[PDB]
């Protein structure tokens, strides 16, 4: 998992 939380809504 390399997805920062500000990119969750995308």
């Amino acid at each position, epitope marked *: 998992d390399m997805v920062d*939380s*500000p990119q969750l809504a995308t």
Partner: antibody, heavy 121, light 113 residues
Framework: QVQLVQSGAEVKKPGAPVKVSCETS????????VHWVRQAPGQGPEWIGR????????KYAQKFQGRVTMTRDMSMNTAYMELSGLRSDDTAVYYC??????????????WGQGTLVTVSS | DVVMTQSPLSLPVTPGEPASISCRSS???????????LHWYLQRPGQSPQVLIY???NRASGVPDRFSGSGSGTDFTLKISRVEAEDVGLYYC?????????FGQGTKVEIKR
């Protein structure tokens, strides 16, 4: 309220591992990342890594990769952080932190009270 | 890693007078969705960091009305309108647009006499 509650202060000897716990309440544990930060005395704070409770996926900072392990328990709403190969430079206050964004909305950070870890013989 | 540069490092303030702490980032902390990922927190000795201002300008619950935050996507400011002995401590800006989270150098606020 949102509440992160860490285990007690630890005295370990050089090369011993320390396992800190972080128990949570007041929000859906699955929805937010649990990040781990530390502050050594005479040093600025430092981000160690992060765990996603639902997936279990972890990201660690390069300097910590290969000696830190983060796990979680969904049933007990608890996050853990096991650091190994301790030396005097690992003496610090260790803080678990709730992340900001959950998919729908982005909010504030919520910090645990801290856990002092003393590396000494 | 995003580089935060905070200034000034030391800040004596006469009681009642205001205080301004600046913090700039190497790249924009304004995400395209509109949210600015910069946070201001206070460190007193022997206790957890107290969140003062989050997501650029939003005041945290139970923080006094004299604390305020503003800024563009790269240049930020913490404003305290009336400093008192309660406010003495070590102030930090931090970014959470990208992991690793990175922190400013710190500002040591003290009362001036």
């Amino acid at each position: 309220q949102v509440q992160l509650v860490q285990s007690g202060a630890e005295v370990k000897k050089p090369g011993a591992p320390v396992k800190v716990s972080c128990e949570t309440s007041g929000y859906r544990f699955s929805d937010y990342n649990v990040h781990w930060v530390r502050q050594a005395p005479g040093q600025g704070p430092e981000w160690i890594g992060r765990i996603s409770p639902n997936s279990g996926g972890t990201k660690y900072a390069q300097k910590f990769q290969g000696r830190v392990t983060m796990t979680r328990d969904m049933s007990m709403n608890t996050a853990y952080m096991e650091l190994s190969g301790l030396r005097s430079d690992d003496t610090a206050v260790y803080y678990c932190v709730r992340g900001h964004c959950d998919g729908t909305t982005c909010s504030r950070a919520y910090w645990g009270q801290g856990t002092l870890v003393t590396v000494s013989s | 890693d995003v580089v935060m540069t905070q200034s000034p490092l030391s800040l004596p303030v006469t009681p009642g007078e205001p205080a301004s702490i600046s913090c700039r980032s190497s790249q924009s902390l304004l995400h395209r969705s509109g949210h600015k990922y910069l946070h201001w927190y206070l460190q007193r000795p022997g206790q957890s960091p107290q969140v003062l201002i989050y997501l650029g300008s939003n005041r945290a619950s139970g923080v006094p009305d004299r604390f305020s935050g503003s800024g563009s996507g790269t240049d930020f400011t913490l404003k305290i309108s009336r400093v008192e002995a309660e406010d003495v401590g070590l102030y930090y800006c931090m970014q959470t647009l990208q992991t690793p989270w990175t922190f400013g150098q710190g500002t040591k606020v003290e009362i001036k006499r």
